[PDB]
């Protein structure tokens, strides 16, 4: 009945995610802070 509708649902959710990432800076936060808590891990290491 609705292969097209379910596909549109999945891709529309995908597009909402795309808008969230292109807008929300904290959307990937859990890598970002991990990158950051790695970054000033090294940065503290050089500040040290």
């Amino acid at each position: 009945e609705n292969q097209k509708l379910i596909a549109n649902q999945f891709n529309s959710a995908i597009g909402k995610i795309q808008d969230s990432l292109s807008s929300t800076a904290s959307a990937l936060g859990k890598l970002q802070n991990v990158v950051n808590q790695n970054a000033q891990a090294l940065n503290t290491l050089v500040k040290q």
Binding site: L42, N43, V46, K47
Partner: protein
Amino acid sequence: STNLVKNKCVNFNFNGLTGTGVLTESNKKFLPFQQFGRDIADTTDAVRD
């Protein structure tokens, strides 16, 4: 003082800057009243002759 060399690991002994590295030509621009540049982690990555 000594002349400048490129693509060779040499010591750096400036007025107040010490280190060892490789000096290559670059495209950055500095303000008239500046001496040396830094990166985010207070590590030099470009200087004026």
